[PDB]
Amino acid sequence: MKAVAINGYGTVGKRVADAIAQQDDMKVIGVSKTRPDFEARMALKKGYDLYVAIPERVKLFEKAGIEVAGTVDDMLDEADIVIDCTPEGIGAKNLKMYKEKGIKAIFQGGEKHEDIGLSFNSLSNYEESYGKDYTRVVSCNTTGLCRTLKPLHDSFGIKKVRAVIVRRGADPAQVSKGPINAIIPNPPKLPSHHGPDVKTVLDINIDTMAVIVPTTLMHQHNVMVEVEETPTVDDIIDVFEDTPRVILISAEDGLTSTAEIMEYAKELGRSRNDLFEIPVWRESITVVDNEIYYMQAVHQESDIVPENVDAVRAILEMEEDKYKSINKTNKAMNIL
Amino acid sequence: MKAVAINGYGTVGKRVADAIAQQDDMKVIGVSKTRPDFEARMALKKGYDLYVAIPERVKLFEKAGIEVAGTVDDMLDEADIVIDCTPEGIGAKNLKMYKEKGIKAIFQGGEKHEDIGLSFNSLSNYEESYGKDYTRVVSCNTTGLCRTLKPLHDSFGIKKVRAVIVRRGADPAQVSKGPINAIIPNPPKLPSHHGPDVKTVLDINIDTMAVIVPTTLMHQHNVMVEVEETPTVDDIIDVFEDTPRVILISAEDGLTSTAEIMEYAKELGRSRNDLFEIPVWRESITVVDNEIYYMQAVHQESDIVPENVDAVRAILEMEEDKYKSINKTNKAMNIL
Amino acid sequence: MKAVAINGYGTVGKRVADAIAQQDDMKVIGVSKTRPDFEARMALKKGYDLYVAIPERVKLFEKAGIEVAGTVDDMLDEADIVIDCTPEGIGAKNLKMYKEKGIKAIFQGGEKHEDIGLSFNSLSNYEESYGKDYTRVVSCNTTGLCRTLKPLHDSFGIKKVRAVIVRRGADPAQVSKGPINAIIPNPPKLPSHHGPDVKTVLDINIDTMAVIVPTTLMHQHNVMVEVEETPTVDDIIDVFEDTPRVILISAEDGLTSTAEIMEYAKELGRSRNDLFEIPVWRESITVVDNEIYYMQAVHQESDIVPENVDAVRAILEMEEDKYKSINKTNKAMNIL
Amino acid sequence: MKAVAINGYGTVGKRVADAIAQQDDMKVIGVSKTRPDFEARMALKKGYDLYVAIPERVKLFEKAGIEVAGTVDDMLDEADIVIDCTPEGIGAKNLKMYKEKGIKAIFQGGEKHEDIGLSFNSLSNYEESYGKDYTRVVSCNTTGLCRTLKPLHDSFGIKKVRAVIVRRGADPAQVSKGPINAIIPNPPKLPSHHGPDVKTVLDINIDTMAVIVPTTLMHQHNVMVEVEETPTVDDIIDVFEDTPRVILISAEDGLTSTAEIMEYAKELGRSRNDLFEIPVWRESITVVDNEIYYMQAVHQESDIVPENVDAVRAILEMEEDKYKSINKTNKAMNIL
Ligand SMILES: NC(=O)c1ccc[n+]([C@@H]2O[C@H](COP(=O)([O-])OP(=O)(O)OC[C@H]3O[C@@H](n4cnc5c(N)ncnc54)[C@H](OP(=O)(O)O)[C@@H]3O)[C@@H](O)[C@H]2O)c1
Ligand SMILES: NC(=O)c1ccc[n+]([C@@H]2O[C@H](COP(=O)([O-])OP(=O)(O)OC[C@H]3O[C@@H](n4cnc5c(N)ncnc54)[C@H](OP(=O)(O)O)[C@@H]3O)[C@@H](O)[C@H]2O)c1
Ligand SMILES: NC(=O)c1ccc[n+]([C@@H]2O[C@H](COP(=O)([O-])OP(=O)(O)OC[C@H]3O[C@@H](n4cnc5c(N)ncnc54)[C@H](OP(=O)(O)O)[C@@H]3O)[C@@H](O)[C@H]2O)c1
Ligand SMILES: NC(=O)c1ccc[n+]([C@@H]2O[C@H](COP(=O)([O-])OP(=O)(O)OC[C@H]3O[C@@H](n4cnc5c(N)ncnc54)[C@H](OP(=O)(O)O)[C@@H]3O)[C@@H](O)[C@H]2O)c1
């Protein structure tokens, strides 16, 4: 088994832990935490070995009755690779340590591309990470945009993408963040960061705008794409039905909003009721001459999870063909 | 096993369906819907036979490509008991039809006690439904209050309960309901109806007040109980730890809010990440004079689920010992 | 003064009544209500004669303690014009009575353009309502897009507009409407109604998309405009500074969201804390080749109010110059 | 006229500045800010002299185009009293400077009673601040509880108060604070701070519990009061109608929530559409034996405002009869 360490057992971290553990060629040998809370105790219940960020906080865990295996420094001595799921900006800080231990690592979307030097999205540029040392899985929204823009680019040739991102204010468990009742340009200076992030893995012309609204469940995307070859609605539907980690939903069938989508995710019975796939509203798919309009949604806590599994296989050279990794990841995770 | 029909496969009904199906002594022989949406299609994927409320709607399902097994009248012919999970007021109307077929039935808390004649809560009055025909499982909030007040009455003797209910405005999937940004007395004439409802199953002196606020996750209760024999905080903690379906949580461990409680439920991994249990904040348990103050929360979509399973064992005379049924329901549901 | 009647003293109608009354050449001779609640009582406190929608409701107001002047039929006999602010679809029903009485009327944006025959926006098509009988002031979002797209068209020649509307779910006082926690495509089939609606007053190529989010304060617009003449950011700023009822704001000065904008509107001290103007985030104004990007917001309860006052001048032939009416309206309303 | 300085032109401070300016015996000689934002610019629009907290930030305001009159030190030399409206804990730090200056001052409810020495509520203990040096106007919720508890105490004699406070998460313009979707015990260790805070101004036995919910508009209170003399619903209604700054509203009249109350406040037309008074739901007034139950709401941004004007008259010995200051304050502020 490749031995994977998870530095940061948080929102992404705990889900990546489980997805890695579900594969047949990897196992989790450690997850880390900085504070002794209910997630630290649930890691133990789930069978993981729990490690502590810095050595002087180990006494905290001891005092709360939480068994500790050691520190992150010890956790990395035993890994083949480490998946960094720490807060934005901490991953780059952890990189000095990773290089000093000579261990390879995968970072999440909140890190800057140029601190890591390489960005990953399984369908768009899996081969750019093959046999590399360090790679950044792009963000939840960036990932969601690539899921449908990549297959569009291959089939019809992207001329220009204009997208407006309606972002969730805070994940379900983050109770200290707003807004309670506001719409916030994010940021007001345009265009937003999503464009340039998409360009780190997919070479297309794209401008984005984003705002923040008082919802916690999912982000929502308003996408407009000018293409080179004239598509039809029927052609776009087949492309989305065929592409991996994308599903078509219907408002007519009752999925009129991100709340009803997450309700559907609860009926699917996967880990945490998560929706790793990007749902596209079928009724929204529209063609105006050589321009495609459509709406989609992103379950921000889990869409990047499968991308982390695929990234391990690229970085550790376990599989050279991205489709094989994608497919094996999906089978072990019960992806739709 | 005993063959159970579920009339009304909605928020409560789809959950009761799965809980019956987990039992070793019961099975679901059908669930019913009135419209062909995604939940109707998920019902077929869980292996349930789908029945349509009225004969003239069978063709709506046929044209949507959803295979139906018959009408509600047909479903009932196959069952030993029907669990009615139809909207408030419809249950009373279905009572007539159940009488005509003769089938025994369980109703939900939205129905009036006067129209059903009996109310039910597993720990406080299981024996009053034993071998009877029809019983009303009390509402989400009423069940939540009984879970902690019954054990308090048994150990210390309740003299008076004063409770203020902070209600969630609408379930997560219900997007057409408010409020978006208000606090609404519910109702403004006091005392509210949770008190009388608790008294249909638990013979105590209780006055309640309630409001609605902009959240969908859980209800939150502020309870103040005057007792006959004043206990210590440790005694109360012992009582709550020993009573079934009540858990103790701590804000010191990170469960500072209903959003973090539901995050905890997602790490538990039961069906739909539900929280069947009533969580009490350990640090809130306080004794002032001869009175106990505490705070708890209720996951309104599922705290009544297990109660419905126990009501089937009482109504059909499968188990005369309320503790043996509660224990068996709990093992099959993976309840804490 | 011209005698103006307000049929429907609701969200828009109470605001239109105060704006009409502030004018030096118009006065309110009555407002109507269907139910005797607190706003019926406040209408009397403001000096307005209060009329009842239907005559068989006069007794209802009288035993509620509310002194009524008569019915809507009596109201129209007192007026030179009626401004209809009834719920969507009722304005077209009232149109029949207006015609039978022989009275000119102005309608709101929720009516269908085809049931009215003429739409109005003060800056883009004032002259088309000059001396006519009936006209529809376009909706809050339609008005907001016209305020900035008209001047852009006049200066650079619009070739194509793409706009994403992020809509508030329900006005502050509307506590029974959601969504509490969701993003809802509105509708899922595109393009949405805003584009065609803009075209009833402004002859341009425009496609819009829209969603509803859990906010009450303001709608927010993401606007992308391809123009004929190459624009510069400083030139657009001058255009927007020069155009009536448009203001430039900055996130650097603390106006980072719709909530801080509305806070700024309470500092202005006009009627009900309203923001009649369309605020454009200064920093969002971007030029890419011949394409302009910018974000704006809309205080949906009141951006249409000043349009109604200019529509009366058009309809009753009080002023043929649209800039004289706009400036006269702005001065009486204390519009920036 | 007494020359008053406002230190901290924020949520409370901007409102206190206007209320002071409205009096015929006081004037505002200055308001202070720390950052040059839209509120600093609006202070100048309103005619106030703007002072900067720290001297090196003077240049910072000047460079932003904001004419400054000097530093806080300068401002305090021009005043007979300073009303501190700085963030919690900051009042205490500033008290040292006020003492060094020999200037009397009023603090807001965020400061600790022990750090200031004395607390104030106009009706409850106005005389305790008569001629003193420093006093603390108690918080929005403490003031709200005292407005109806004091009169009930005087008429019937309070034996015990049990209250559950439903708190708004963040003020309308605060967009960085949550929760978006949760209920948070505040705190989980009971009883809460309101009880002890009421006792700094009113000598009664009271226990409180508080929670935070996703609303911005008003707090809401659920109040249970055991009293010595047997009350009747009608005598309570007369007691609240007769008491200053308390109004009776009804759900039947359309005021069913905090959002509809605030809608009523917008029809009243005072400064910023505030609601300085405490609304009590008339239909919630209930008597059971010798216990009164009732619900009220608080507009947290302004209920403390008139209290601050009365504190100035107490502190500066401008009036010794608390009813004369209350009534004069009410008349100048257009209070019901
Ligand atoms: N939030 C999303 O939906 C999302 C989606 C995709 C990608 N991302 C990105 O993924 C990354 C992680 O985000 P997240 O939401 O999962 O954050 P999170 O929930 O706050 O999790 C961060 C985890 O890192 C741990 N941690 C903090 N400092 C650490 C340190 N110095 N060393 C080791 N562990 C440390 C924390 O432990 P303690 O809790 O005990 O302090 C926590 O378990 C960021 O780059 C973010 O932008 C986030
Ligand atoms: N919601 C809670 O949190 C909660 C908790 C505890 C107890 N309860 C109580 O449980 C009951 C059900 O509430 P709920 O939230 O589950 O309602 P719900 O989600 O609206 O579900 C009602 C279900 O009944 C079906 N239905 C409607 N009319 C029917 C009829 N004539 N015959 C058969 N099925 C019919 C509906 O089918 P279609 O959807 O296809 O139209 C739907 O599946 C009420 O008494 C409620 O007070 C609710
Ligand atoms: N809502 C907005 O923000 C908004 C913004 C811009 C434009 N508009 C458009 O303005 C129009 C009105 O919307 P609104 O939000 O102001 O509606 P609203 O608040 O519901 O007010 C409608 C008013 O009409 C009265 N009414 C109902 N039926 C009536 C009848 N048959 N005859 C006379 N009066 C009657 C109601 O009286 P009672 O209350 O006594 O029943 C109420 O006073 C719609 O076309 C809407 O699309 C709305
Ligand atoms: N928020 C409420 O609803 C409320 C209600 C009742 C009572 N209170 C109590 O009222 C007090 C103030 O709260 P708030 O909501 O008004 O706060 P706020 O909105 O944050 O305003 C505080 C003001 O103080 C200024 N300030 C900050 N540091 C300063 C310093 N060192 N010297 C002088 N001025 C300084 C800030 O200026 P800048 O903006 O330029 O930085 C701001 O103008 C607290 O005790 C609070 O607990 C609050």
Side-chain angles (χ1 to χ4, degrees), chain A residues 202-248:
Chain A
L202 176 61
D203 192 10
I204 57 172
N205 179 16
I206 176 170
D207 294 340
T208 52
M209 290 177 73
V211 295
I212 298 172
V213 313
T215 180
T216 62
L217 305 177
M218 307 180 73
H219 305 298
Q220 180 281 345
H221 286 188
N222 303 276
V223 191
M224 289 159 278
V225 186
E226 293 188 79
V227 292
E228 302 275 10
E229 315 275 46
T230 305
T232 61
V233 166
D234 281 335
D235 283 344
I236 295 155
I237 290 167
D238 294 334
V239 170
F240 290 160
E241 291 181 327
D242 279 21
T243 200
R245 300 174 183 167
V246 169
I247 54 173
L248 285 308

Side-chain angles (χ1 to χ4, degrees), chain D residues 17-76:
Chain D
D18 299 350
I20 291 305
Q22 286 171 316
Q23 312 301 303
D24 53 38
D25 53 356
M26 303 165 192
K27 54 175 165 165
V28 172
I29 52 78
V31 312
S32 66
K33 282 272 283 147
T34 81
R35 62 218 308 298
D37 58 23
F38 76 95
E39 292 180 322
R41 298 171 189 285
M42 288 308 296
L44 301 175
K45 274 205 140 208
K46 287 174 196 293
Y48 299 126
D49 274 359
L50 186 52
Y51 294 83
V52 178
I54 44 185
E56 309 316 321
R57 294 201 160 192
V58 170
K59 165 148 161 258
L60 192 60
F61 286 56
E62 304 193 284
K63 91 190 209 182
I66 309 178
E67 300 290 1
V68 147
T71 55
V72 161
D73 185 81
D74 290 312
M75 184 181 70
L76 301 178

Side-chain angles (χ1 to χ4, degrees), chain C residues 7-12 33-35 85-87 108 110 171 300:
Chain C
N7 190 28
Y9 188 73
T11 301
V12 173
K33 280 278 288 161
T34 75
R35 50 218 313 294
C85 303
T86 61
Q108 300 317 310
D171 282 330
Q300 74 290 338

Side-chain angles (χ1 to χ4, degrees), chain B residues 165-325:
Chain B
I165 307 312
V166 182
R167 310 182 60 266
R168 69 85 187 88
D171 282 331
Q174 303 180 289
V175 299
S176 48
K177 295 204 53 168
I180 294 165
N181 178 27
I183 300 164
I184 313 179
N186 186 218
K189 183 172 209 281
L190 310 191
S192 79
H193 79 93
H194 309 81
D197 258 332
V198 167
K199 292 168 164 173
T200 61
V201 301
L202 177 65
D203 186 18
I204 55 174
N205 185 168
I206 171 166
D207 283 355
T208 57
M209 300 171 66
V211 298
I212 299 164
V213 307
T215 181
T216 61
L217 303 183
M218 295 184 85
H219 299 303
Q220 181 275 346
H221 299 173
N222 310 271
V223 193
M224 283 162 290
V225 191
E226 285 192 283
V227 292
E228 313 281 16
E229 340 217 282
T230 310
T232 64
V233 173
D234 287 335
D235 287 337
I236 298 157
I237 288 171
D238 296 334
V239 180
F240 288 159
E241 295 188 323
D242 286 350
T243 192
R245 302 175 186 166
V246 170
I247 52 175
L248 281 302
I249 55 155
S250 150
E252 321 148 89
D253 192 52
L255 304 181
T256 75
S257 63
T258 54
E260 280 135 336
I261 291 162
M262 301 307 303
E263 192 72 22
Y264 175 56
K266 291 173 212 161
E267 311 301 307
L268 256 20
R270 279 94 56 107
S271 168
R272 299 182 180 85
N273 321 322
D274 281 346
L275 187 79
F276 311 103
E277 303 87 351
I278 295 318
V280 173
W281 274 276
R282 192 187 235 97
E283 304 93 354
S284 77
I285 303 167
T286 318
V287 173
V288 176
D289 304 323
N290 67 348
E291 172 168 26
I292 304 171
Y293 299 163
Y294 58 104
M295 278 168 177
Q296 53 182 30
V298 179
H299 175 220
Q300 74 285 345
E301 300 173 286
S302 77
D303 71 324
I304 71 296
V305 179
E307 305 298 318
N308 271 265
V309 183
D310 297 316
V312 174
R313 291 198 196 95
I315 288 270
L316 301 180
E317 291 159 288
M318 309 173 52
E319 176 53 69
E320 190 167 15
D321 181 354
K322 81 192 184 181
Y323 303 103
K324 292 205 215 299
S325 182

